[PDB]
Amino acid sequence: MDQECIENYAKVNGIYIYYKLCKAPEEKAKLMTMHGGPGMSHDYLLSLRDMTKEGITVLFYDQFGCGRSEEPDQSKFTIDYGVEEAEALRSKLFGNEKVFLMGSSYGGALALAYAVKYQDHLKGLIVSGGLSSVPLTVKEMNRLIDELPAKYRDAIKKYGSSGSYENPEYQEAVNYFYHQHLLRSEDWPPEVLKSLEYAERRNVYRIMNGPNEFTITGTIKDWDITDKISAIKIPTLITVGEYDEVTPNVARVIHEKIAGSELHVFRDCSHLTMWEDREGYNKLLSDFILKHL
């Protein structure tokens, strides 16, 4: 039915990286996945496991410094290193095979940076709630914040300006935003909480990203490779939720640059669409993958 995903410890260049590879039956192609954050874990992407019964193998893993993986030197907390970490893993794990790369959110940005350099080692590309620019994302998130009820908006422009991220009136504003643009479900699945827990437990999120989804003061604050992605020539699927915290306008910019790419906006979905519409999401991706073998 399913076959017990297999877990193992790697050792890519210098450090220990955890990776879970759920295989076949009837191997048609492999799909490497990249969780978001930066600084979350592979867990919230587990819903994509269903695609194994479609002949698609889904490779999971905690990126450097995340989840179960060990973190490297701080100077390596970069998207460029994450790229080399992914390529290195692929090469050491699949030799010279071609593969499909999916990316969620910051994982989407990482996937784009990967593809830009190693699309040669790539069969297909999927970007969900991703971005080619952190400054653009931030400007869009600021608009979403301004459409928020005066209370939560004012609470963000007050306690956010004094570093009072711990303040209750501030956390209450973060939950409202999240339940509107991060995940629009009653019962947040367990896998989502584990990744969230992991984000706060390790040091990647705090350093590379910042305090939260809409306060990106970390090291990637100026990252923007919008001018490089048009170099991507492989088949590409871009998805984004209607109420997505990383807005569809952000998704459009990626779409415009990658010729032949398809763009899908899931209605009534936000950022974590794998959970909001698990079935149409898994279907859309598996259809895209198979038709591009």
Side-chain angles (χ1 to χ4, degrees):
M1 200 27 231
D2 259 277
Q3 327 198 119
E4 247 213 305
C5 292
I6 123 175
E7 300 137 50
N8 175 226
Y9 240 170
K11 167 85 164 183
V12 300
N13 46 114
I15 67 166
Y16 282 66
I17 299 306
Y18 169 79
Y19 71 101
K20 182 155 63 181
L21 183 52
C22 319
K23 289 194 174 178
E26 304 277 328
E27 242 262 55
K28 279 352 181 186
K30 324 72 204 305
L31 173 72
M32 197 183 291
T33 64
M34 308 177 144
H35 61 271
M40 306 195 94
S41 59
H42 83 285
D43 311 288
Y44 79 89
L45 292 185
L46 283 175
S47 63
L48 278 58
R49 196 190 327 85
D50 308 359
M51 305 191 306
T52 74
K53 61 184 183 179
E54 302 301 311
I56 311 137
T57 259
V58 286
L59 170 73
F60 292 104
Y61 84 108
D62 299 322
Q63 291 151 38
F64 66 90
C66 307
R68 308 148 178 76
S69 287
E70 79 181 321
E71 49 161 280
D73 161 50
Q74 302 254 318
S75 81
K76 296 194 169 185
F77 283 26
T78 68
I79 291 187
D80 289 336
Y81 179 77
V83 171
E84 300 305 342
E85 181 179 71
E87 182 34 278
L89 188 64
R90 189 204 54 70
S91 173
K92 211 66 176 192
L93 207 56
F94 306 124
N96 310 296
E97 235 184 275
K98 304 295 182 177
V99 131
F100 275 47
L101 216 217
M102 174 271 190
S104 168
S105 198
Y106 155 78
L110 187 69
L112 289 167
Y114 176 89
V116 185
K117 188 186 206 177
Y118 295 82
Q119 51 172 144
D120 297 54
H121 292 269
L122 278 166
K123 254 195 199 187
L125 174 63
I126 302 173
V127 174
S128 300
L131 48 128
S132 64
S133 175
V134 173
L136 174 64
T137 300
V138 174
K139 90 147 171 182
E140 287 283 320
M141 235 161 252
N142 289 162
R143 177 174 61 67
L144 300 189
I145 282 306
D146 284 328
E147 309 184 325
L148 236 49
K151 195 198 179 196
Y152 305 135
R153 162 163 102 182
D154 285 6
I156 289 174
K157 68 176 183 181
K158 290 183 183 172
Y159 304 117
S161 301
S162 68
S164 301
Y165 307 125
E166 71 288 338
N167 189 82
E169 296 173 61
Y170 182 81
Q171 225 89 87
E172 189 178 49
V174 178
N175 289 145
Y176 194 74
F177 187 99
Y178 279 29
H179 285 285
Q180 199 68 204
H181 308 291
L182 184 65
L183 209 191
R184 300 164 67 78
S185 180
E186 241 133 56
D187 204 0
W188 277 19
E191 295 94 320
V192 170
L193 312 178
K194 196 170 189 179
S195 287
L196 291 177
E197 176 67 6
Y198 266 123
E200 178 187 52
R201 294 306 140 199
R202 317 293 277 83
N203 301 301
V204 177
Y205 193 86
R206 177 178 58 73
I207 299 174
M208 287 184 77
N209 179 279
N212 56 58
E213 294 299 64
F214 59 83
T215 314
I216 155 122
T217 62
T219 58
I220 59 172
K221 63 185 175 66
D222 302 316
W223 185 90
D224 187 335
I225 67 179
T226 296
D227 49 290
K228 287 243 112 174
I229 63 174
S230 75
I232 301 180
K233 256 69 188 154
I234 58 174
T236 302
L237 175 62
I238 303 144
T239 73
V240 62
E242 183 174 19
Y243 301 90
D244 208 315
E245 55 165 32
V246 185
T247 82
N249 287 284
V250 174
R252 186 211 84 231
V253 171
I254 303 177
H255 181 223
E256 304 185 314
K257 251 47 182 185
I258 308 174
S261 71
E262 326 183 15
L263 166 64
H264 192 280
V265 187
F266 293 82
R267 301 298 192 279
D268 305 289
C269 294
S270 60
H271 200 59
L272 300 197
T273 65
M274 331 71 213
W275 301 97
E276 296 174 310
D277 190 300
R278 184 174 181 164
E279 248 72 331
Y281 181 79
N282 277 163
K283 184 198 182 195
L284 190 71
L285 273 70
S286 48
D287 287 343
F288 178 67
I289 278 154
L290 263 34
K291 66 167 53 151
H292 285 291
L293 263 351

